[PDB]
Design a protein around this motif. Structure first.
Motif, PDB file in Angstrom:
ATOM      1  N   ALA B 115       0.796  -1.221  -0.253  1.00 43.35           N
ATOM      2  CA  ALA B 115       0.088  -0.175  -0.023  1.00 43.35           C
ATOM      3  C   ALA B 115       0.747   1.362   0.000  1.00 43.35           C
ATOM      4  N   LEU B 116       2.004   1.124   0.830  1.00 45.31           N
ATOM      5  CA  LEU B 116       2.698   2.400   0.856  1.00 45.31           C
ATOM      6  C   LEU B 116       3.498   2.648  -0.720  1.00 45.31           C
ATOM      7  N   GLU B 117       3.952   1.515  -1.273  1.00 49.50           N
ATOM      8  CA  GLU B 117       4.543   1.666  -2.676  1.00 49.50           C
ATOM      9  C   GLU B 117       3.530   2.265  -3.722  1.00 49.50           C
ATOM     10  N   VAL B 118       2.101   1.882  -3.492  1.00 50.82           N
ATOM     11  CA  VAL B 118       1.293   2.490  -4.502  1.00 50.82           C
ATOM     12  C   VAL B 118       1.006   3.972  -4.301  1.00 50.82           C
ATOM     13  N   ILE B 119       1.171   4.466  -3.069  1.00 43.00           N
ATOM     14  CA  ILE B 119       1.164   5.760  -2.781  1.00 43.00           C
ATOM     15  C   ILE B 119       2.159   6.647  -3.374  1.00 43.00           C
ATOM     16  N   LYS B 120       3.312   5.914  -3.170  1.00 42.27           N
ATOM     17  CA  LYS B 120       4.430   6.857  -3.801  1.00 42.27           C
ATOM     18  C   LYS B 120       4.294   7.042  -5.330  1.00 42.27           C
ATOM     19  N   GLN B 121       3.843   5.789  -5.682  1.00 42.50           N
ATOM     20  CA  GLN B 121       3.688   6.077  -7.368  1.00 42.50           C
ATOM     21  C   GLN B 121       2.973   7.086  -7.774  1.00 42.50           C
ATOM     22  N   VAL B 122       1.836   7.107  -7.191  1.00 44.34           N
ATOM     23  CA  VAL B 122       0.841   8.108  -7.583  1.00 44.34           C
ATOM     24  C   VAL B 122       1.020   9.446  -7.026  1.00 44.34           C
ATOM     25  N   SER B 123       2.283   9.649  -6.084  1.00 47.12           N
ATOM     26  CA  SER B 123       2.443  10.858  -5.499  1.00 47.12           C
ATOM     27  C   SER B 123       3.350  11.473  -6.720  1.00 47.12           C
ATOM     28  N   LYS B 124       3.185  12.980  -6.412  1.00 43.41           N
ATOM     29  CA  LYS B 124       3.679  13.930  -7.352  1.00 43.41           C
ATOM     30  C   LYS B 124       4.626  15.032  -6.737  1.00 43.41           C
ATOM     31  N   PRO B 125       5.661  15.392  -6.994  1.00 45.97           N
ATOM     32  CA  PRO B 125       6.641  16.488  -6.350  1.00 45.97           C
ATOM     33  C   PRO B 125       6.074  17.732  -6.397  1.00 45.97           C
ATOM     34  N   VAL B 126       6.437  18.596  -5.639  1.00 48.03           N
ATOM     35  CA  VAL B 126       6.125  20.006  -5.581  1.00 48.03           C
ATOM     36  C   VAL B 126       7.111  20.765  -4.969  1.00 48.03           C
ATOM     37  N   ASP B 127       7.339  21.998  -5.398  1.00 52.00           N
ATOM     38  CA  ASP B 127       8.370  23.064  -4.919  1.00 52.00           C
ATOM     39  C   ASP B 127       8.305  23.450  -3.285  1.00 52.00           C
ATOM     40  N   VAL B 128       8.918  23.092  -2.423  1.00 56.69           N
ATOM     41  CA  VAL B 128       8.624  23.543  -1.153  1.00 56.69           C
ATOM     42  C   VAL B 128       9.265  25.019  -0.843  1.00 56.69           C
ATOM     43  N   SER B 366       6.537  14.894  -2.255  1.00 53.47           N
ATOM     44  CA  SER B 366       5.493  13.789  -2.778  1.00 53.47           C
ATOM     45  C   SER B 366       4.251  14.332  -1.993  1.00 53.47           C
ATOM     46  N   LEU B 367       3.198  14.564  -3.105  1.00 51.81           N
ATOM     47  CA  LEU B 367       1.800  15.068  -2.624  1.00 51.81           C
ATOM     48  C   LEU B 367       0.872  14.007  -3.035  1.00 51.81           C
ATOM     49  N   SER B 368      -0.375  13.786  -2.289  1.00 49.67           N
ATOM     50  CA  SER B 368      -1.329  12.696  -2.679  1.00 49.67           C
ATOM     51  C   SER B 368      -2.755  13.587  -2.814  1.00 49.67           C
ATOM     52  N   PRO B 369      -3.590  13.188  -3.791  1.00 50.01           N
ATOM     53  CA  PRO B 369      -4.750  13.535  -3.814  1.00 50.01           C
ATOM     54  C   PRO B 369      -5.668  12.774  -2.926  1.00 50.01           C
ATOM     55  N   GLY B 370      -6.701  13.685  -2.471  1.00 46.13           N
ATOM     56  CA  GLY B 370      -7.912  13.555  -1.513  1.00 46.13           C
ATOM     57  C   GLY B 370      -9.011  13.329  -1.917  1.00 46.13           C
ATOM     58  N   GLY B 371     -10.178  13.128  -1.206  1.00 46.91           N
ATOM     59  CA  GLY B 371     -11.584  13.028  -1.614  1.00 46.91           C
ATOM     60  C   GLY B 371     -11.770  11.481  -2.254  1.00 46.91           C
ATOM     61  N   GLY B 372     -11.184  10.447  -1.875  1.00 50.11           N
ATOM     62  CA  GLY B 372     -11.406   9.155  -2.254  1.00 50.11           C
ATOM     63  C   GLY B 372     -10.261   8.818  -3.741  1.00 50.11           C
ATOM     64  N   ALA B 373      -9.832   9.739  -3.985  1.00 49.94           N
ATOM     65  CA  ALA B 373      -8.805   9.719  -5.311  1.00 49.94           C
ATOM     66  C   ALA B 373      -7.766   8.728  -5.051  1.00 49.94           C
ATOM     67  N   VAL B 378      -5.406   2.884  -4.812  1.00 55.30           N
ATOM     68  CA  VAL B 378      -4.675   1.627  -4.369  1.00 55.30           C
ATOM     69  C   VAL B 378      -5.623   0.716  -4.480  1.00 55.30           C
ATOM     70  N   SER B 379      -6.683   0.820  -4.419  1.00 55.18           N
ATOM     71  CA  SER B 379      -7.927  -0.571  -4.312  1.00 55.18           C
ATOM     72  C   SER B 379      -7.571  -1.134  -5.748  1.00 55.18           C
ATOM     73  N   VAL B 380      -7.314  -0.274  -6.960  1.00 53.99           N
ATOM     74  CA  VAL B 380      -7.312  -1.080  -7.969  1.00 53.99           C
ATOM     75  C   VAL B 380      -6.162  -1.639  -8.232  1.00 53.99           C
ATOM     76  N   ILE B 460       0.088  12.570   5.632  1.00 49.68           N
ATOM     77  CA  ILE B 460      -1.494  12.266   6.221  1.00 49.68           C
ATOM     78  C   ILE B 460      -1.919  10.718   5.722  1.00 49.68           C
ATOM     79  N   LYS B 461      -1.376  10.314   4.431  1.00 51.12           N
ATOM     80  CA  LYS B 461      -1.736   9.088   3.934  1.00 51.12           C
ATOM     81  C   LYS B 461      -0.938   8.071   4.536  1.00 51.12           C
ATOM     82  N   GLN B 462       0.497   8.293   4.791  1.00 53.10           N
ATOM     83  CA  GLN B 462       1.261   7.364   5.228  1.00 53.10           C
ATOM     84  C   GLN B 462       0.897   6.958   6.754  1.00 53.10           C
ATOM     85  N   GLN B 463       0.480   7.723   7.879  1.00 51.68           N
ATOM     86  CA  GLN B 463       0.225   7.297   9.125  1.00 51.68           C
ATOM     87  C   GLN B 463      -0.958   6.881   9.037  1.00 51.68           C
ATOM     88  N   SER B 464      -1.929   7.216   8.052  1.00 53.69           N
ATOM     89  CA  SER B 464      -3.322   6.833   7.848  1.00 53.69           C
ATOM     90  C   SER B 464      -3.347   5.180   7.894  1.00 53.69           C
TER      91      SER B 464
END
Lengths: 512, 485, 523, 507
Positions: B115-128, B366-373, B378-380, B460-464
């Motif tokens: 599950a943690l590997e799928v989140i890292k694949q769908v995550s996108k970088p952002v300038d901090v 890395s950022l992850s989309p919310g609202g069930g995205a 991951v479920s797929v 937020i999704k990691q510790q979730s």
């Protein structure tokens, strides 16, 4: 009220079984811990079976003996309270079935005492001294399974030989043949310069420090060298003589024959110049924690202030240490000090290698829990294989021993030996393994191996087969790494027997 | 099997209450107190805390919410519902299918790694380092609150706080610190009543509200010297100066004492060119030693010369907010000003939640989309890896995919649409199209999130999912519950 | 109410879970007449039990649909349709209406029946060889009687091959009558002494003085429906008594007439007279002196099947021995079976017979009675081989069930819409078949299930699996490890049984979901 | 459910518990009260179990195996029922642990396959070796009579037991062919053996004390109809319109009876047997002609007369053919039994005999009657079946021994099942010691000592409690018992454990 007759015999079985059901799921490392809820509403989570029996409420005298049974196990061996309760619970169920057979409990108690005396002699043929120390290592599987939850577990195959080979060198004798392994040994120094493939084993003391002088050679007095550990610096001291106070102590070190000087706060430049002509290597900013463990091995003593009463001196090479040779190898982007061949050391040092400082801290705590399990079992020179080999071996020996009487106890000895089959049974339940397969095949391998044993002639041995719950197959527990000292198994069966006897001796209960 | 049913029932009954507490469109819960009062707040922390519990599994889920609150500011009900749905999907597998509980535990640990590997694949970088990009992120916790009008000023106060205590360093020699940040001790702020938010500044140091003994004093010194001692100033006329003479040996520019200062010691220290502070609390002296390094010493004769007064910007005593302050500007102290104490109390919890969003972005781009995205993405992947996983653990491994689909289905039930119809349609969007198509709270129809970015930090999704596996496996290991002390 | 109706069916569902399979359980049936019987087949149990609940009547009426047109699938239609309602419980609690649930099964039924034509492995050539019949009959004997599978294989296959004539590529003329194969049981002995003989077997005793006929081939047989007695008048003709002088003429009159009637009949060359009615005392003494075998057949059903074998025809009158209506038989003798001597009927290499009878022997009549019901179901399995694609077959013992699951899940992702939820649940419902064989055999369920999917899921360079399609669900009973291939023992279910059982169980399951309310009123 | 299987096991224990004390010749007897109120007491388990008529379905399974045990074998009906239910009693804790009953039922047949091959190895065929014709029957007869009140008088009983089986064909022997009639009063050692059949002396009518007690070659005739004129119960109503016709009809009825009387007189049959009572007219007329007649002959007694002299019964006295008559060698009516009893002796064609017993009470003779049946069944199966094995627990203890070693060589769940199968076999020797009063704890433990030393013939001594060899005790059993018992017990055990539901329809 008053309770007497067969009513109290069946009441103690239901009371003991209800209490024993708590520790049946905690048996073995694969077991599952349970929660203890009090009347206040708080709770706790622990896998220790000894702390559960202490906080468990028992309103019956049959289970109250089992509560105090864990106290006798903790005050002697300190471990194994879970297996002792399960043994005492099965012996009561087997003895309760003999009531319908018109067998008097006194002979049942006597039959258990006779089988207990012969069980000790049967373990003598089982237990053995330390074996397989040349050509193979039986301790490599302990560190592999313990660190398998960490990144180091992948490379633990090569790292296992580092602990095993150093474990034979750390043995010593303190007072009257103890033969115990030091807990504070195996110094830890963590640095990451490269990949973990470069990990090396240092059979000696590794101190982290520099030479501080490029003019003097790095190898001096290979035959013998005296190490002087000091705290206060040799630098000029303040509150006109001020530099002459610490200068007098310099001549006391030179006349003492100390080639290596260790100072916690460092050494000045004026004192270092005199060390060049005397070929004495000084060290600055020593670690005060490492000087205490080195002084005990080299026979030295940590000195915070150098003085006696009105004088100042080294007491003519008294507080100084002893070492065979001090040489500094090139460590490939690391700098330390190697100390090997002291008088009595029985220790070593291992450099940890990892991806980052967080991984070095996890690998440091992994070896703490790994080597601990190894040294606590090997602390005693008499050990037996675990994993159910003790309970399974006694079933075969007591089977043929029952023919020695041939009157009454033959039926009691057969039930006493078969009662030990509950330990491997419930052990495979929490492991998701069938209890009618591995336990059934456990007796077949031990029974066939003991056929040619008394004849003193055999083709192949094929004995000492245990139960491996990880892969679900029959392997040797000696190679698997499961070992327990004999003193733990003797006191376990002795305490579990006396706990079941006290229950069988009650034919009447007076409840006010 | 009676204890295993009670562990799932107790965890499901607690999670059933907050099922309507998830989302911006989430419903409200009305609790019945024994008195004539009631609670209309939809926050899962204030609801479940006031609910009486019996089975011990309910108390274990309460401590899980308190741990998530100290880490992340939002998503409190998300972890509890996700942890409770896993035990619900494994209920028929544990009883009807007769699956060993450790096999399920070993399956949840294996599914947690994938599950943690799928989140890292769908995550996108952002300038901090972009200040304008960090405003749209924190805005998720800003809007629908009183601070939306000050959001422009609130982001400047929140970003400057977390950037003060963080240290950016890395190499292959000393390792990677992974950006260690402490919000509790170092970022702790003190609010001053009255004033305006626009005049609030971010100060780095320890703040003191005590005045100055003399009005005329040097406002800045090149190389200051700060001495920290708890001994008061008084006769233990020459003995009072004798105690100060040992202090003046190093020529300090600042003198801080815990107790009061007598009038005799004020005249001797006036000509010495030093600052005098009195009535200083002992708890504040521990924070000064971190930014300064001066060690508190009882007797003035034992004061060491190793400590210095370096890293002190200004001595200015200038009055701020009709009260004399003291400005000492890995630590900082922000001085906040507001229209009232009730306004400052709302900014308090809002500032901590604003910094928690900005911090999690700094732990990784890395950022992850919310609202069930992310939940559906991951479920797929779990369904594809399930058919390729041999062994008995394959069946409990599929139960995680059903639990990942419960979070987006929960928001659909509160949206008003058909949860069964919108589930099959949204699942097909992740298989064919991209994973960025979420669920809109305002409309309630499946739409793309490209318009209004719902992306949240991965922490937020990691510790979730992390703590959800540890909380679910903890209740499955207990096969018996007894009463005793 | 739909959920409550499933709970009532779940109690009946668990009854059939212990039925199917050789390791299953047998249920004792105590009739209201004071007769204790036991049988494996569940269709017989439903007949003795009174069915009331409406959701239960659907599965019972669907069970009778399986009794016709085939003898196999009684436990298949009950377990399959029962599991489809269990997997539908997750859809009901989710909020999905039962209307779209029925529509989802209709789309999956057409996809399943179409794939069964492409999953066929072999095809029966209808050679009617003794070895070819051993492949179809052997798995049918299984799941009913254990230990007799190899023993009854040669007995049933030999009797069926005798009824089946020699023909090829001809489907116009029907054959294989149900009553043509009769199974009788005799107490005593064992199954090792049982043989296969061509002809009918009669349990009545040879009351005539002739125990056995000669060895000459082609003995004439005369079947007489009218009982033996003096010839009377078709109009009135009532014998009355008046005086004692007429009493002597009644005995002496019938003595000469009966002796004269049997004379001319026996002189025609017929050595066997079959009387379907009672035989007089005086008429029996005359036929015994002429060497005529007297055989009484009170059952009118046995005389119908004899016309197609020996060729004789029943005559409603008496005294007209028509030679054109007489039959032919080579050997008629009396053999002792189980201690009792009975006259049998057989022939050797002539006058091909369409009716045969199997003679069985056993010590315990209880288990021997179930053998008759097991063979009768085995005979009906021969009906599964017909011209309209009757020879098609599929691997049994859970081989086709699990293999079909992987093919249905592929069609689920290809079909967009809400039908994906119904397609996935339709494939999961097939997991009850392997679990039934694994649970009743004592093996661990958690061990067998992952080993099945690992065999059916392989990585091959192509979209069609080649090497092994034959992996089934094996009943081990062995020591350590290993399984058997379906092709090794040739244990499989025909396509005609599986295709018919699934089509009926699919409609029967969707029928229960259609009724959400019941109403009972006075008729 | 799982509770229904356990409930069916406990239902068979209650039936098995009653049959436990009936195991062994010295065991206790079951007292059953039939619905007809007739009280019967016997130690044979066949007749016992047939009187229970238990409604429970699993109890009927034990009845089916009991009928096959009595038919094909005839001995061991008690042990086959105890062994069939013992496997279910030991399998009760196995089902609670989660082990399926199928593997338990399959494990039983695995040990039976090794047990059948073991019986053939223990079967010794011996006939004329170290024995003879008379010594074989004499030594085996005193064994069944041991531990009884007839042991002191067994010297005279063995001589009559040997001649009983020699009077019948050695190829086909039936225990029902030897009749036993209980005679109250007299000494038990004064009984004799009779080749023919005897009567009960039921005659209450005057005319006794006059009869010769020795006949040379009398003719036996069986008449199916009674002959009488004026009986002691009914009467005759004669009503006519003439006064002189009253005596005419009375004399006419006398001539109609005298008709059938003189027809036998012309035949000259000295013995007349009829199932109906004979009036005083025929008994008085036959006195002067020296013709004996016996009325109210039992049906079972007259049927044995047909097979005795080879005659047959005829309805009337007119058409009787000469082959229906029969003649014996000697006819003697003695005082044996404190009453005069007439009997036939010396019939060469007789296929049946009668063995008379005497005693102070009829219940004591019944204990001897059932004791003689045990010695007949041993000789009955010793002729046709040439394989003889050591019984009395000898072979039973051997089957359990070898199966314990085979479990160690068989991996899997079959190790504990076969070991439990051999442990369940210990109920047979146990109950034999518990019935007679021996200690089951000491004897069963002392027997297992020498039993493992390589000698397979060690039995259990039924006289004095001790370990010993049944070969010297002359305790023998045929090999058919051990083969049929293991097959019937396994089939009955596997049938009940395979029933998970009990369906009973009422109406």
């Amino acid at each position: 009220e008053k309770i007497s007759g067969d009513d109290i015999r069946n009441q103690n079985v239901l009371a003991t079984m209800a209490v024993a059901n708590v520790v049946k799921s905690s048996l073995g490392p694969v077991g599952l811990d349970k929660m203890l809820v009090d009347d206040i509403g708080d709770f706790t989570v622990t896998n220790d079976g000894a702390t559960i029996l202490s906080l468990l409420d028992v309103q019956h005298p049959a289970g109250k003996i089992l509560v105090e049974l864990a106290q006798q196990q903790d005050r002697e061996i300190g471990d194994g309270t879970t297996s002792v309760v399960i043994i005492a619970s099965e012996l009561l169920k087997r003895a309760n079935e003999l009531v319908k057979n018109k067998i008097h409990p006194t002979t049942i108690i006597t039959g258990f005492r006779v089988a207990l005396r012969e069980a000790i002699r049967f373990i003598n043929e089982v237990l053995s001294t330390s074996v397989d120390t040349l050509g193979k290592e039986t301790l490599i599987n302990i560190a592999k399974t313990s660190m398998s939850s960490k990144i180091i577990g992948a490379d633990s195959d090569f790292f296992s030989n580092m602990v095993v080979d150093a474990l034979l060198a750390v043995k010593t004798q303190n007072s009257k043949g103890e033969i115990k392994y030091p807990v504070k040994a195996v110094n830890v120094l963590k640095a990451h310069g490269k990949s973990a493939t470069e990990s090396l084993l240092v059979p000696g003391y590794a101190l982290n420090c520099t030479v501080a002088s490029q003019a003097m050679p790095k190898r001096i007095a290979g035959g013998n060298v005296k190490i002087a550990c000091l705290d206060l610096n040799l630098q000029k001291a303040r509150m006109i003589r001020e530099a002459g106070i610490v200068l007098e102590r310099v001549k006391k070190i030179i006349d003492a024959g100390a080639q290596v000087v260790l100072t916690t706060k460092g050494i000045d430049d004026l004192c270092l110049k005199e060390f060049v002509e005397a070929k004495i290597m000084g060290v600055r900013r020593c670690k005060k924690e490492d000087l205490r463990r080195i002084a005990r091995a080299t026979g030295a003593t940590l000195v915070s202030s150098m003085s006696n009463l009105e004088g100042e001196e080294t007491f003519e090479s008294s507080y100084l240490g002893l070492c065979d040779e001090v040489v500094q190898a090139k460590f490939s982007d690391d700098e330390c000090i190697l100390i090997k061949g002291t008088s009595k050391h029985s220790s070593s040092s291992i450099i940890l290698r990892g991806a980052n400082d967080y991984s070095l801290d996890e690998m440091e705590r992994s070896l703490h829990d790994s080597l601990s399990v190894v040294k606590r079992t090997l602390e005693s020179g008499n050990v037996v294989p675990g994993g159910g080999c003790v309970e399974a071996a006694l079933n075969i020996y007591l089977d043929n021993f029952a023919t020695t009487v041939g009157s009454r106890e033959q039926l009691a000895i057969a039930e006493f030996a078969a009662a030990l089959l509950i330990i491997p049974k419930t052990l495979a339940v929490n492991a998701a393994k069938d209890s009618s397969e591995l336990v059934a095949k456990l007796r077949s391998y031990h029974a066939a191996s003991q056929m040619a044993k008394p004849e003193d002639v055999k083709r192949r041995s094929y004995r000492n087969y245990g139960l491996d719950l990880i892969r679900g197959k029959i392997v040797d527990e000696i190679h698997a790494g499961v070992l327990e000292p004999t003193i733990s198994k003797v006191k376990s069966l002795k305490s579990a027997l006396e706990a079941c006897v006290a229950i069988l001796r009650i034919d009447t209960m007076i409840t006010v | 099997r009676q204890a295993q049913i009670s562990n799932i029932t107790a965890a499901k009954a607690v999670a059933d209450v907050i099922r309507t507490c998830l989302g911006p469109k989430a419903m409200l819960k009305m609790l019945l107190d024994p008195m004539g009062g009631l609670v209309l707040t939809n926050d899962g922390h204030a609801i479940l805390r006031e609910i009486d519990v019996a089975h011990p599994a309910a108390k274990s889920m309460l401590e899980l919410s308190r741990t998530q609150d100290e880490e992340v500011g939002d998503g409190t009900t998300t972890v509890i519902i996700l942890a409770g749905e896993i035990l619900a999907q494994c209920a028929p597998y544990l009883i009807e299918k007769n699956i060993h509980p450790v096999i399920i535990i070993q399956a949840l640990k294996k599914a947690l790694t994938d599950a943690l590997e799928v989140i890292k694949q769908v995550s996108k970088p952002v300038d901090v380092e972009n200040d304008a990009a960090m405003k749209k992120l924190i805005q998720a916790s800003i809007g629908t609150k009183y601070v939306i009008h000050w959001s422009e000023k609130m982001c400047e106060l929140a970003l400057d706080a977390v950037k003060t205590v963080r240290k950016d360093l890395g190499q292959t020699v000393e390792g990677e610190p992974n950006f260690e940040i402490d919000i509790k001790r170092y970022v702790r702020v003190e609010k001053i009543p009255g004033g305006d938010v626009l005049d609030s500044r971010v100060l780095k140091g320890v703040l003191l509200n005590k005045d100055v003994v003399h009005p005329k004093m040097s406002r800045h010194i090149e190389n200051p010297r700060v001495v920290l001692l708890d001994c008061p100033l008084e006769y233990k006329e020459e003995q009072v100066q004798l105690m100060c003479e040992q202090i003046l040996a190093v020529r300090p520019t600042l003198v801080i004492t815990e107790k009061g200062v007598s009038d005799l010691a004020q005249h001797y220290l006036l000509k010495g060119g030093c600052s005098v502070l009195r009535r200083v609390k002992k708890s504040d002296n521990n924070r000064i030693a971190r930014v300064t390094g001066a060690t508190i010493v009882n007797r003035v004769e034992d004061l060491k010369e190793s400590d210095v007064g370096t890293n002190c910007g200004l001595f200015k005593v200038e009055m701020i907010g009709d009260e004399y302050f003291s400005f000492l500007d890995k630590a900082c102290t922000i001085m906040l000003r507001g229209g009232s104490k009730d306004i400052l109390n709302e900014i308090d919890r809002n500032l901590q939640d604003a910094m928690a969003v900005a911090r999690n972005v700094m732990l990784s781009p890395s950022l992850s989309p919310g609202g069930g995205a992310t939940e559906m993405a991951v479920s797929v992947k779990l369904a594809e890896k399930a058919k390729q996983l041999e062994g008995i653990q394959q069946w409990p491994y599929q139960a995680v995919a059903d639990a990942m689909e419960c979070i987006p289905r929960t928001l659909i039930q509160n949206a008003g649409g058909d949860p069964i119809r919108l589930l099959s349609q949204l699942r097909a969007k992740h298989a064919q199209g991209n994973f960025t198509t979420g669920i809109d709270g305002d409309k309630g129809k499946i739409v793309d999130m490209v318009s209004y970015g719902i992306w949240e930090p991965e922490v937020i999704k990691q510790q979730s999912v992390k703590t959800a596996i540890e909380s679910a496996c903890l209740l499955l290991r207990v096969d018996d519950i007894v009463s005793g002390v | 109410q739909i959920i409550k109706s499933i709970a009532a069916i779940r109690e009946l569902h668990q009854m059939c879970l212990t039925s199917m399979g050789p390791c299953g359980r047998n249920k004792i049936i105590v009739n209201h007449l004071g007769k204790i019987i036991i049988t494996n087949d569940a269709a017989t149990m439903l007949r003795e039990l009174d069915i009331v609940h409406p959701a239960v009547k659907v599965l019972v009426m669907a069970t009778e649909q399986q009794k016709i047109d085939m003898g196999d699938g009684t436990n298949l239609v009950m377990i399959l349709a029962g599991e489809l309602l269990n997997v539908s419980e997750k859809l009901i609690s989710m909020g999905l209406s039962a209307v779209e649930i029925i529509q989802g099964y209709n789309m999956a039924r057409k996809f399943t029946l179409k794939e069964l034509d492409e999953m066929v492995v072999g095809e029966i050539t209808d050679k009617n060889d003794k070895n070819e019949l051993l492949k179809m009959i052997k798995p049918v004997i299984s799941s009913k009687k254990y230990g007799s599978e190899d023993i009854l294989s040669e007995l049933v296959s030999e009797a069926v091959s005798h009824v089946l004539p020699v023909a090829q590529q001809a489907g116009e003329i029907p054959y294989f009558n149900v009553d043509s194969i009769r199974v009788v049981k005799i107490m005593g002995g064992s199954l090792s002494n049982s043989t296969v003989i061509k002809g009918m077997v009669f349990n009545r005793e040879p009351e005539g003085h002739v125990k056995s006929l000669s060895e000459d081939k082609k003995h004439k047989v005369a079947v007489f429906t009218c009982p033996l007695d003096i010839a009377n008048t078709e109009t009135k003709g009532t014998v009355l008594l008046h005086n004692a002088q007429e009493m002597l003429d009644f005995s002496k009159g019938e003595e000469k007439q009966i002796d004269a009637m049997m004379k001319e009949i026996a002189d025609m060359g017929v050595e066997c007279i079959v009387a379907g009615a009672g035989v007089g005392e005086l008429a029996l003494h005359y036929l015994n002196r002429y060497g005529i075998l007297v055989l009484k057949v009170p059952s009118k059903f046995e005389l119908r099947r004899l016309c197609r074998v020996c060729g004789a025809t029943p005559l409603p009158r008496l005294g007209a021995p028509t030679p054109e209506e007489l039959g032919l038989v080579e050997t008629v003798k009396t053999m002792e079976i189980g201690g009792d001597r009975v006259t049998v009927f057989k022939q050797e290499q002539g006058e091909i017979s369409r009716t045969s009878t199997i003679i069985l022997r056993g010590a315990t009549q209880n288990n021997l009675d179930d053998i008759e019901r097991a063979i009768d179901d085995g005979v009906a399995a021969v009906k599964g081989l017909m011209k309209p694609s009757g020879g098609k077959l599929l691997p049994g013992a859970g081989a086709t069930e699990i293999e079909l699951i992987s093919r249905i899940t592929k069609y689920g992702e290809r079909t967009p819409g809400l039908l994906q939820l119904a397609i996935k649940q339709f494939a999961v419902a097939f997991e009850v078949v392997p679990r039934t064989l694994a649970e009743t055999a004592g093996l661990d369920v958690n061990e067998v299930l992952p080993n099945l999917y690992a065999a059916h899921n392989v990585t091959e360079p192509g979209a069609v699996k080649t090497d092994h399609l034959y992996k089934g669900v094996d009943i081990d009973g062995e020591s350590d490890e290993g399984v058997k291939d379906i092709r090794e023992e040739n244990i499989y279910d025909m396509l005609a049984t599986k295709k018919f059982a699934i089509n009926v169980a699919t409609e029967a399951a969707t029928t229960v979901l259609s009724i959400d309310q019941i109403i009972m009123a006075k008729k | 459910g799982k509770g229904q299987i356990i409930s069916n096991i406990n239902a068979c224990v209650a039936v098995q518990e009653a049959l436990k004390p009936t195991l062994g010749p010295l065991g206790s007897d079951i007292l059953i009260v039939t619905s007809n109120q007739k009280t019967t007491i016997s130690n044979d388990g066949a007749t016992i179990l047939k009187l229970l008529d238990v409604v429970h379905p699993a109890a009927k399974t034990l009845v089916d195996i009991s009928r096959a045990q009595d038919a094909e074998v005839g001995d061991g009906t008690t042990s086959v029922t105890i062994l069939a239910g013992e496997l279910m009693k030991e399998a009760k804790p196995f089902l609670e642990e989660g082990i399926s009953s199928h593997l338990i039922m399959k494990g039983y047949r695995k040990a039976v396959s090794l047990a059948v091959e073991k019986i053939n190895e223990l079967a010794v065929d011996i006939t004329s070796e170290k024995s003879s014709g008379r010594e074989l029957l004499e030594r085996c007869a005193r064994t069944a009579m041991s531990s009884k009140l007839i042991h002191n008088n067994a010297d005279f009983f063995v001589k009559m037991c040997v001649d009983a089986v020699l009077s019948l064909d050695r190829n086909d022997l039936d225990d029902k062919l030897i009749g036993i009639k209980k005679i109250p009063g007299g000494a038990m050692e004064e009984s004799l053996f009779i080749n023919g059949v005897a009567f009960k002396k039921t005659f209450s009518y005057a005319g006794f004390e006059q009869q010769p007690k020795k006949f040379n070659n009398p003719k036996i005739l069986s008449l199916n109809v009674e002959l009488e004129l004026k009986a002691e119960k009914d009467n005759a109503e004669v009503r006519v319109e003439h006064v002189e016709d009253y005596q005419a009809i009375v004399d006419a009825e006398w001539q109609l009876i005298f008709e059938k009387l003189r027809q036998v007189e012309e035949t000259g049959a000295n013995i007349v047997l009829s199932k109906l009572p004979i009036g005083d007219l025929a008994t008085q007329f036959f006195a002067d002609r020296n013709i004996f007649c016996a009325g109210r002959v039992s049906a079972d007694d007259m049927n044995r007369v047909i097979q005795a002299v080879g005659g047959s019964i005829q309805s009337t006295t007119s058409d009787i053919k000469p082959e229906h008559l029969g003649t014996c060698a000697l006819f003697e009516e003695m005082q044996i039994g404190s009453e005069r009893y007439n009997l036939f002796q010396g019939c060469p064609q007789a296929k049946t005999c009668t063995l008379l017993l005497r005693g102070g009470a009829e219940q004591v003779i019944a204990e001897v009657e059932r004791s003689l049946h045990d010695a007949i069944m041993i000789v009955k199966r010793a002729l046709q079946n040439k394989l003889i094995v050591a019984g009395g627990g000898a072979t039973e203890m051997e089957v359990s021994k070898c199966l314990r070693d085979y479990s160690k060589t068989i991996a899997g769940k079959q190790q504990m099942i076969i070991n439990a199968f051999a442990k369940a076999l210990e109920v047979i020797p146990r109950q034999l010691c518990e019935n007679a009063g021996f200690d089951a704890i000491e004897i069963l433990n002392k027997l297992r000592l020498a039993h493992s030393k390589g000698e397979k013939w060690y039995g259990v001594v039924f006289e004095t409690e001790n370990i010993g060899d049944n070969f010297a005790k002359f305790v023998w059993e045929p090999a058919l018992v051990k083969i049929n018992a293991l097959n019937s017990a396994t089939e009955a055990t596997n049938l009940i454990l395979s029933v998970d539901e009990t369906i009973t329809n009422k109406g």
